[PDB]
Amino acid sequence: VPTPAEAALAAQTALAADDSPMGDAARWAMGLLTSSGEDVAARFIPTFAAAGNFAETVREWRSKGPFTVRAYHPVAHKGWVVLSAPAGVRYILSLTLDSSGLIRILTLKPETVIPDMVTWNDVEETLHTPGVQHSVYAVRLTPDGHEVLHASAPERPMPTGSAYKLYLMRALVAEIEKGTVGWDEILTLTPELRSLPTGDMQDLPDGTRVTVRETAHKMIALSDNTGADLVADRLGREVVERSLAAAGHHDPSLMRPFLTSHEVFELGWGDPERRAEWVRQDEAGRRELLEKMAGVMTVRGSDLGATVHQLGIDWHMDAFDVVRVLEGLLQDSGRDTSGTVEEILTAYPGLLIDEERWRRVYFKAGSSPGVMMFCWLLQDHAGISYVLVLRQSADEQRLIGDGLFLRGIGAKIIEAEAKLLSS
Numbered sequence: 001v002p003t004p005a006e007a008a009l010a011a012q013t014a015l016a017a018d019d020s021p022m023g024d025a026a027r028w029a030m031g032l033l034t035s036s037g038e039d040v041a042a043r044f045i046p047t048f049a050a051a052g053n054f055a056e057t058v059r060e061w062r063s064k065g066p067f068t069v070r071a072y073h074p075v076a077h078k079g080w081v082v083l084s085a086p087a088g089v090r091y092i093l094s095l096t097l098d099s100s101g102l103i104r105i106l107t108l109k110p111e112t113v114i115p116d117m118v119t120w121n122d123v124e125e126t127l128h129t130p131g132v133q134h135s136v137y138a139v140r141l142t143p144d145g146h147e148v149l150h151a152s153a154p155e156r157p158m159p160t161g162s163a164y165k166l167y168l169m170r171a172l173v174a175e176i177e178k179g180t181v182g183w184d185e186i187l188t189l190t191p192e193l194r195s196l197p198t199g200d201m202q203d204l205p206d207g208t209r210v211t212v213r214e215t216a217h218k219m220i221a222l223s224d225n226t227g228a229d230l231v232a233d234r235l236g237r238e239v240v241e242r243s244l245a246a247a248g249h250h251d252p253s254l255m256r257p258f259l260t261s262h263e264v265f266e267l268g269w270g271d272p273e274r275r276a277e278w279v280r281q282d283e284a285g286r287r288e289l290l291e292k293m294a295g296v297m298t299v300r301g302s303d304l305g306a307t308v309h310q311l312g313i314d315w316h317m318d319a320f321d322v323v324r325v326l327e328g329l330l331q332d333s334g335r336d337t338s339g340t341v342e343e344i345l346t347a348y349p350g351l352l353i354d355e356e357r358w359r360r361v362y363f364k365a366g367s368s369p370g371v372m373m374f375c376w377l378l379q380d381h382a383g384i385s386y387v388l389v390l391r392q393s394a395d396e397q398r399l400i401g402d403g404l405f406l407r408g409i410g411a412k413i414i415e416a417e418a419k420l421l422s423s
């Protein structure tokens with residue numbers, strides 16, 4: 001158990017030594033904060049829209065220092081640096097990178113505090129926020145069903161954002177198995193198929209040719225919305241929908257029509273009249289509205305904010321549905337002797353994982369205004385699997401925040417697995 005001084009020193013050294021895209025970006029961003037006084041444009045994605053306000057943003061950040069590194073948490077294309085400022089005030093620097101190491105998101109925010117968890121009640125009492133509906137569901141998978149380790153509101157259907165991509169993955173695998181689509185088949189990016197971040201594929205030029213395998217990899221590992229939309233277009237909505245009952249969903253009608261990310265963005269934050277039409281329409285009327293809406297996006301990232309999940313403009317499922325889709329994916333992966341499914345599912349575990357404990361970890365996050373979820377399947381080297389599903393929804397995005405809180409609650413549960421999961 002490293003003492004505070006030990007932990008900070010280790011973090012400082014690790015940041016200095018990290019020879020990776022995240023290490024490069026984190027050191028550069030820390031340089032911005034600690035330094036005496038076009039280099040910016042070269043470090044960020046080409047379409048970085050805050051470039052004008054950025055000089056002021058950095059001035060304001062710098063005014064909060066001086067800063068000392070206390071913790072460093074690189075996780076693939078995501079990274080967090082915990083900083084202490086004067087008088088014991090703490091902040092977190094959050095980085096999200098694109099596929100070549102350019103910065104997409106860079107924030108410096110008040111520290112997200114998550115205590116070490118001893119009991120499930122610690123989890124519940126930490127997580128609870130007035131005005132936020134939450135759910136925690138943890139199970140051990142066994143031959144003859146699931147052993148419930150903890151449950152709060154698992155039966156409640158809730159919006160889950162990009163968790164829907166798990167169903168899309170199962171639908172894709174089902175079609176690969178049938179031979180109607182192939183891993184090396186080429187998908188082509190068109191202006192109409194481009195969606196918003198999360199993801200990187202939207203940044204590719206019109207006409208870019210990508211394999212089904214690479215597109216599915218990004219769909220899961222980067223939560224790539226454009227990747228997901230390319231897959232959903234190739235399979236077709238009917239195929240995606242007809243798959244839902246088999247892949248584990250209890251009431252497919254909640255995700256009919258099964259929306260694309262493009263559709264959620266455009267409907268959710270585009271013209272209000274069209275959105276009011278959705279609300280008053282039945283399934284037929286909604287399908288008709290979506291067909292009419294097909295085309296190039298008008299909605300931009302800056303338009304998002306107001307919650308729309310309460311109108312059905314999201315993907316609703318219960319915690320049991322999440323466990324079923326994950327267990328289904330575990331089965332699909334084992335059946336795939338090529339290891340293609342496994343490589344996609346294990347690429348990004350969402351945390352730094354103890355690989356001596358866990359043979360495989362599947363992970364998926366979901367987020368939309370007023371929506372946050374994280375889920376993991378963890379299987380040890382003996383073959384015992386656990387599934388953890390964390391969900392939050394609210395009428396106001398500010399009650400949820402950037403998702404580090406819920407992720408960090410998951411991190412603490414997994415850290416305390418011997419007490420909370422495998423006791």
Ligand SMILES: O=C(O)[C@H]1/C(=C/CO)O[C@@H]2CC(=O)N21
Pocket residue numbers: 078161162198222223350365366367402403404
């Ligand atoms: O993949 C991740 O870890 C991302 C994510 C993606 C949702 O599409 O949602 C949570 C919030 C965040 O930064 N996480």
Ligand SMILES: O=C(O)[C@H]1/C(=C/CO)O[C@@H]2CC(=O)N21
Pocket residue numbers: 071073080082112351404407408409411412
């Ligand atoms: O390891 C942890 O406890 C948490 C954390 C907390 C931020 O101080 O940062 C990383 C991301 C995450 O969930 N981990």
